[PDB]
Short mmCIF file of all heavy atoms in Angstrom, two decimals:
data_model
loop_
_atom_site.label_atom_id
_atom_site.label_comp_id
_atom_site.label_asym_id
_atom_site.label_seq_id
_atom_site.Cartn_x
_atom_site.Cartn_y
_atom_site.Cartn_z
N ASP A 563 -45.11 28.94 27.68
CA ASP A 563 -45.36 28.26 26.41
C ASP A 563 -46.15 29.12 25.42
O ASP A 563 -46.28 28.76 24.26
CB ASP A 563 -46.12 26.95 26.63
CG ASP A 563 -45.20 25.81 27.00
OD1 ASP A 563 -43.97 25.96 26.85
OD2 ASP A 563 -45.71 24.75 27.43
N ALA A 564 -46.67 30.25 25.89
CA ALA A 564 -47.58 31.07 25.09
C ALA A 564 -46.87 32.25 24.39
O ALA A 564 -45.78 32.65 24.79
CB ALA A 564 -48.71 31.58 25.96
N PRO A 565 -47.51 32.80 23.35
CA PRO A 565 -46.94 33.98 22.68
C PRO A 565 -46.77 35.14 23.66
O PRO A 565 -47.63 35.36 24.51
CB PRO A 565 -48.00 34.32 21.62
CG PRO A 565 -48.67 33.03 21.34
CD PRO A 565 -48.71 32.30 22.66
N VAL A 566 -45.65 35.85 23.55
CA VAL A 566 -45.32 36.92 24.47
C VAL A 566 -46.07 38.20 24.12
O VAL A 566 -46.18 38.55 22.95
CB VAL A 566 -43.80 37.20 24.46
CG1 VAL A 566 -43.48 38.46 25.24
CG2 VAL A 566 -43.02 36.00 25.00
N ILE A 567 -46.57 38.90 25.13
CA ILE A 567 -47.26 40.17 24.91
C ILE A 567 -46.62 41.32 25.67
O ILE A 567 -45.92 41.11 26.66
CB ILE A 567 -48.73 40.11 25.37
CG1 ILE A 567 -48.79 39.77 26.87
CG2 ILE A 567 -49.51 39.08 24.56
CD1 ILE A 567 -50.05 40.23 27.55
N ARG A 568 -46.89 42.55 25.23
CA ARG A 568 -46.66 43.71 26.07
C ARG A 568 -47.96 44.01 26.83
O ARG A 568 -49.00 44.23 26.21
CB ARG A 568 -46.21 44.91 25.22
CG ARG A 568 -45.82 46.13 26.03
CD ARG A 568 -45.11 47.17 25.17
NE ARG A 568 -44.70 48.32 25.98
CZ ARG A 568 -45.46 49.39 26.20
NH1 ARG A 568 -46.67 49.46 25.68
NH2 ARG A 568 -45.00 50.38 26.95
N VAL A 569 -47.90 44.02 28.16
CA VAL A 569 -49.12 44.09 28.99
C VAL A 569 -49.98 45.32 28.75
O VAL A 569 -51.20 45.20 28.61
CB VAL A 569 -48.80 43.96 30.50
CG1 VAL A 569 -50.04 44.32 31.35
CG2 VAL A 569 -48.33 42.56 30.81
N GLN A 570 -49.37 46.50 28.72
CA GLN A 570 -50.09 47.72 28.34
C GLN A 570 -50.82 47.59 27.01
O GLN A 570 -51.96 48.06 26.87
CB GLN A 570 -49.14 48.92 28.26
CG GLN A 570 -48.46 49.28 29.57
CD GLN A 570 -47.08 48.64 29.70
OE1 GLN A 570 -46.87 47.48 29.33
NE2 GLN A 570 -46.12 49.40 30.24
N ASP A 571 -50.17 47.00 26.02
CA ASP A 571 -50.77 46.91 24.69
C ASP A 571 -51.95 45.95 24.70
O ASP A 571 -52.98 46.20 24.07
CB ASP A 571 -49.75 46.45 23.65
CG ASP A 571 -48.68 47.50 23.36
OD1 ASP A 571 -48.83 48.67 23.79
OD2 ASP A 571 -47.70 47.15 22.68
N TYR A 572 -51.79 44.84 25.42
CA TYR A 572 -52.86 43.86 25.54
C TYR A 572 -54.07 44.50 26.23
O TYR A 572 -55.20 44.39 25.75
CB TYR A 572 -52.39 42.63 26.31
CG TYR A 572 -53.36 41.47 26.24
CD1 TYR A 572 -53.30 40.53 25.21
CD2 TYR A 572 -54.37 41.33 27.19
CE1 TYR A 572 -54.21 39.48 25.14
CE2 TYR A 572 -55.28 40.28 27.13
CZ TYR A 572 -55.19 39.36 26.10
OH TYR A 572 -56.10 38.31 26.05
N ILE A 573 -53.82 45.19 27.34
CA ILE A 573 -54.88 45.84 28.09
C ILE A 573 -55.61 46.93 27.30
O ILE A 573 -56.83 47.05 27.37
CB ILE A 573 -54.35 46.41 29.42
CG1 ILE A 573 -54.07 45.25 30.38
CG2 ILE A 573 -55.36 47.39 30.04
CD1 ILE A 573 -53.53 45.69 31.70
N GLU A 574 -54.86 47.71 26.52
CA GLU A 574 -55.46 48.75 25.69
C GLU A 574 -56.42 48.20 24.64
O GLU A 574 -57.28 48.92 24.13
CB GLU A 574 -54.37 49.61 25.01
CG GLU A 574 -53.58 50.44 26.01
CD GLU A 574 -52.46 51.23 25.35
OE1 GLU A 574 -52.34 51.20 24.10
OE2 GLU A 574 -51.70 51.89 26.10
N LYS A 575 -56.28 46.92 24.32
CA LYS A 575 -57.14 46.31 23.31
C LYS A 575 -58.44 45.76 23.88
O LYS A 575 -59.27 45.23 23.15
CB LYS A 575 -56.40 45.20 22.57
CG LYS A 575 -55.27 45.70 21.67
CD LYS A 575 -54.43 44.53 21.18
CE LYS A 575 -53.25 44.99 20.36
NZ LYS A 575 -52.38 43.84 19.96
N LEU A 576 -58.61 45.86 25.20
CA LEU A 576 -59.84 45.41 25.83
C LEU A 576 -60.95 46.39 25.50
O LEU A 576 -60.70 47.57 25.29
CB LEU A 576 -59.68 45.32 27.34
CG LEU A 576 -58.57 44.40 27.85
CD1 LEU A 576 -58.43 44.56 29.36
CD2 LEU A 576 -58.87 42.95 27.48
N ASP A 577 -62.19 45.91 25.48
CA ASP A 577 -63.34 46.79 25.37
C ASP A 577 -63.37 47.75 26.57
O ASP A 577 -62.84 47.44 27.64
CB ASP A 577 -64.63 45.98 25.29
CG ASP A 577 -64.70 45.14 24.03
OD1 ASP A 577 -63.90 45.38 23.11
OD2 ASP A 577 -65.57 44.24 23.97
N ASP A 578 -64.01 48.90 26.38
CA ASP A 578 -64.08 49.92 27.43
C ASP A 578 -64.68 49.41 28.74
O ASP A 578 -64.37 49.94 29.80
CB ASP A 578 -64.85 51.15 26.92
CG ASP A 578 -64.11 51.88 25.82
OD1 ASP A 578 -62.89 51.64 25.66
OD2 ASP A 578 -64.74 52.71 25.13
N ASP A 579 -65.54 48.41 28.66
CA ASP A 579 -66.25 47.92 29.84
C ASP A 579 -65.78 46.52 30.26
O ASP A 579 -66.43 45.86 31.08
CB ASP A 579 -67.75 47.88 29.56
CG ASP A 579 -68.08 47.20 28.25
OD1 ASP A 579 -67.16 46.63 27.62
OD2 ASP A 579 -69.26 47.22 27.84
N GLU A 580 -64.65 46.08 29.72
CA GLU A 580 -64.21 44.70 29.91
C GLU A 580 -63.06 44.60 30.91
O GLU A 580 -62.03 45.25 30.75
CB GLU A 580 -63.77 44.14 28.55
CG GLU A 580 -63.26 42.72 28.57
CD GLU A 580 -62.95 42.21 27.16
OE1 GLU A 580 -62.53 43.03 26.30
OE2 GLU A 580 -63.12 41.00 26.92
N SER A 581 -63.25 43.78 31.95
CA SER A 581 -62.21 43.55 32.93
C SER A 581 -61.17 42.58 32.39
O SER A 581 -61.32 42.01 31.32
CB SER A 581 -62.80 43.01 34.24
OG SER A 581 -63.56 44.03 34.88
N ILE A 582 -60.09 42.41 33.14
CA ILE A 582 -59.12 41.40 32.77
C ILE A 582 -58.76 40.56 33.97
O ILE A 582 -58.40 41.09 35.03
CB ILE A 582 -57.85 42.03 32.14
CG1 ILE A 582 -56.88 40.92 31.73
CG2 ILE A 582 -57.22 43.04 33.08
CD1 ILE A 582 -55.78 41.37 30.81
N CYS A 583 -58.88 39.25 33.81
CA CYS A 583 -58.60 38.29 34.88
C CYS A 583 -57.40 37.45 34.48
O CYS A 583 -57.41 36.80 33.43
CB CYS A 583 -59.81 37.38 35.13
SG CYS A 583 -59.51 36.18 36.50
N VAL A 584 -56.36 37.47 35.32
CA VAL A 584 -55.14 36.75 35.02
C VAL A 584 -54.92 35.58 35.99
O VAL A 584 -54.83 35.78 37.21
CB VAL A 584 -53.93 37.70 35.15
CG1 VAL A 584 -52.65 36.93 34.88
CG2 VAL A 584 -54.09 38.86 34.19
N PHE A 585 -54.83 34.36 35.45
CA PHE A 585 -54.53 33.18 36.25
C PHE A 585 -53.04 32.91 36.26
O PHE A 585 -52.42 32.69 35.21
CB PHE A 585 -55.24 31.95 35.68
CG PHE A 585 -56.73 32.01 35.79
CD1 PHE A 585 -57.48 32.80 34.93
CD2 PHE A 585 -57.40 31.26 36.76
CE1 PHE A 585 -58.86 32.85 35.04
CE2 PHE A 585 -58.79 31.31 36.87
CZ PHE A 585 -59.52 32.10 36.01
N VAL A 586 -52.47 32.93 37.47
CA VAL A 586 -51.05 32.74 37.70
C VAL A 586 -50.82 31.44 38.49
O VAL A 586 -51.40 31.25 39.55
CB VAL A 586 -50.50 33.93 38.53
CG1 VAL A 586 -49.04 33.75 38.83
CG2 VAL A 586 -50.74 35.25 37.80
N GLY A 587 -49.99 30.54 37.96
CA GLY A 587 -49.65 29.33 38.70
C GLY A 587 -48.79 29.67 39.93
O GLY A 587 -47.64 30.08 39.80
N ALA A 588 -49.37 29.50 41.11
CA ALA A 588 -48.67 29.82 42.35
C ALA A 588 -47.84 28.63 42.77
O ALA A 588 -48.01 28.07 43.85
CB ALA A 588 -49.64 30.21 43.46
N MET A 589 -46.93 28.24 41.88
CA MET A 589 -46.16 27.01 42.04
C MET A 589 -44.76 27.24 41.51
O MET A 589 -44.50 28.26 40.85
CB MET A 589 -46.84 25.88 41.26
CG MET A 589 -46.82 26.09 39.75
SD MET A 589 -48.39 25.67 38.95
CE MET A 589 -48.66 24.05 39.67
N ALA A 590 -43.86 26.31 41.80
CA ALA A 590 -42.50 26.37 41.29
C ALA A 590 -42.43 25.74 39.91
O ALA A 590 -41.80 26.29 39.00
CB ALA A 590 -41.55 25.67 42.25
N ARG A 591 -43.08 24.59 39.76
CA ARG A 591 -43.02 23.85 38.50
C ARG A 591 -44.34 23.18 38.16
O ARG A 591 -45.00 22.60 39.02
CB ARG A 591 -41.89 22.81 38.55
CG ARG A 591 -40.51 23.41 38.79
CD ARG A 591 -39.39 22.42 38.52
NE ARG A 591 -39.16 21.50 39.62
CZ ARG A 591 -38.17 20.61 39.65
NH1 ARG A 591 -37.33 20.53 38.63
NH2 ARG A 591 -38.02 19.80 40.69
N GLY A 592 -44.72 23.24 36.89
CA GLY A 592 -45.94 22.59 36.45
C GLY A 592 -46.45 23.11 35.12
O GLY A 592 -45.97 24.13 34.62
N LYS A 593 -47.42 22.41 34.56
CA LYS A 593 -48.00 22.78 33.27
C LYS A 593 -48.92 24.00 33.42
O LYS A 593 -49.32 24.36 34.53
CB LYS A 593 -48.80 21.62 32.68
CG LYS A 593 -48.06 20.29 32.67
CD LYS A 593 -48.92 19.21 32.01
CE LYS A 593 -48.29 17.84 32.09
NZ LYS A 593 -49.05 16.81 31.31
N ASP A 594 -49.25 24.62 32.30
CA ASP A 594 -50.10 25.82 32.29
C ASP A 594 -51.59 25.49 32.12
O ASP A 594 -52.36 26.35 31.69
CB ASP A 594 -49.65 26.76 31.16
CG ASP A 594 -49.87 26.15 29.77
OD1 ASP A 594 -50.55 25.11 29.64
OD2 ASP A 594 -49.35 26.72 28.78
N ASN A 595 -51.99 24.27 32.44
CA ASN A 595 -53.36 23.85 32.15
C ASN A 595 -54.33 23.98 33.33
O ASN A 595 -55.45 23.48 33.28
CB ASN A 595 -53.38 22.41 31.61
CG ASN A 595 -52.94 21.39 32.64
OD1 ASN A 595 -52.21 21.71 33.57
ND2 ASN A 595 -53.39 20.15 32.48
N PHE A 596 -53.88 24.66 34.39
CA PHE A 596 -54.66 24.75 35.63
C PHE A 596 -55.97 25.53 35.54
O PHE A 596 -56.77 25.52 36.48
CB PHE A 596 -53.80 25.33 36.76
CG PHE A 596 -53.04 26.56 36.37
CD1 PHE A 596 -53.68 27.79 36.26
CD2 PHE A 596 -51.68 26.48 36.09
CE1 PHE A 596 -52.98 28.92 35.89
CE2 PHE A 596 -50.97 27.61 35.72
CZ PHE A 596 -51.62 28.83 35.62
N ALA A 597 -56.18 26.23 34.43
CA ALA A 597 -57.39 27.02 34.28
C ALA A 597 -57.98 26.87 32.89
O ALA A 597 -58.79 27.69 32.46
CB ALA A 597 -57.09 28.50 34.57
#
């Protein structure tokens, strides 16, 4: 449901000291509101 990104480009925009945490629905079907 969200705007599509290029992962490399998104990551390059992080601050030099900033990690990235990705929440993935480990399910077959459901809404994206789990986090």
Side-chain angles (χ1 to χ4, degrees):
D563 277 348
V566 171
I567 60 156
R568 186 168 182 271
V569 168
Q570 298 94 319
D571 291 349
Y572 191 89
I573 288 179
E574 293 177 4
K575 291 169 184 176
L576 302 173
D577 295 346
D578 293 344
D579 49 7
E580 179 176 33
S581 291
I582 182 166
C583 181
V584 179
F585 293 76
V586 178
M589 66 223 310
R591 300 193 279 185
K593 311 182 186 187
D594 65 12
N595 66 335
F596 47 76

